Amino acid sequence: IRDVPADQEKLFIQKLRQCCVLFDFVSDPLSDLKWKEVKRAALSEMVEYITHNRNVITEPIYPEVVHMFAVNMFRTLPPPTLEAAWPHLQLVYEFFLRFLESPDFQPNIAKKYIDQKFVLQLLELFDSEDPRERDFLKTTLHRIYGKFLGLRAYIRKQINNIFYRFIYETEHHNGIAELLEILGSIINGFALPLKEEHKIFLLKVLLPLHKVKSLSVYHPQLAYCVVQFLEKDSTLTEPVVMALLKYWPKTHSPKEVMFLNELEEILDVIEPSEFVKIMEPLFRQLAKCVSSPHFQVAERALYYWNNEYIMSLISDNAAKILPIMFP
């Protein structure tokens, strides 16, 4: 129908609208090959254009883009289960991304279309089971957070919600890892002194994430977020450490490696006055770990001895830690 360079944006719009036509990859895969290819081409064209030429990029093309994304991406998901529509969706995501981070981007213009409802429909998508979709969503929400001051609170509050239902209500997610990476970056940007709502979020939501059985899928990102709280406000270290010692697997187990890991990362940046408050209960847990029957645990606990910082902490508080290092 159309032809790919005769100046105008009138045909650039026409290409975007061509790409709102949605194809069936799931029931019939041998279906509409020729046209899937036209669409899947026009996307691949539209990426190059936006990612190599400059001022195209005008009031009129902002809604076309945002509709184009929404019509392709905002849909109910299947029952690791990969996306059949990836030949299209990859380029949809690649495009939007390059569009959001284009140097000609006017957030002040895109805010009429990328609104609170848009964000909500994006967050739903994080429950996809296709990891490289969850990867594009991560980066995308991150760009949206960074460039739309008007949406930051809303995004923060909605992420909090997804963690809430993941833990208390039945609902599972498997996009927690990705959302927590976005949270790490949100935490770095909080004003000091920390608003109380963030301190509540830490004790009421972040710390309890250490308890859901699928911890291992997101634990490094969980660890990063807790450590970042403590870098903002070391006054939180006591309840945080005690929470981890509370949720510490009381049965001997190989997931203990992850707690040892996280504790060493807290210990890496701990304040001396904060350490003394938790050293006794902390080192009693390590006593157990050193003598674990699970080889990996003893070793991981024993590896603290390579940490010069921890060794000097032990050494500054020897009178009180020594009796705890075997009787």
Side-chain angles (χ1 to χ4, degrees), residues 262-287 289-326:
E262 173 173 12
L263 227 66
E264 171 165 3
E265 275 188 67
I266 290 158
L267 287 174
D268 272 327
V269 302
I270 201 168
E271 289 276 343
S273 72
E274 288 293 310
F275 174 78
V276 316
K277 301 209 260 197
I278 59 70
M279 62 182 177
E280 281 170 74
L282 191 190
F283 271 73
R284 289 189 225 111
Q285 183 57 243
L286 280 28
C289 291
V290 160
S291 60
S292 166
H294 296 91
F295 192 94
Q296 307 129 167
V297 181
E299 297 278 54
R300 184 65 188 77
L302 283 169
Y303 189 86
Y304 280 28
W305 279 250
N306 299 301
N307 187 135
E308 296 201 59
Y309 184 35
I310 296 170
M311 291 325 280
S312 64
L313 283 184
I314 290 184
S315 176
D316 295 344
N317 300 102
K320 288 227 165 219
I321 291 159
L322 273 35
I324 297 158
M325 279 174 245
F326 34 142

Side-chain angles (χ1 to χ4, degrees), residues 19-36:
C19 301
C20 298
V21 174
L22 298 179
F23 294 86
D24 188 28
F25 293 93
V26 75
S27 304
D28 223 337
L30 287 172
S31 62
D32 308 308
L33 290 348
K34 151 70 89 58
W35 315 93
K36 286 173 169 172

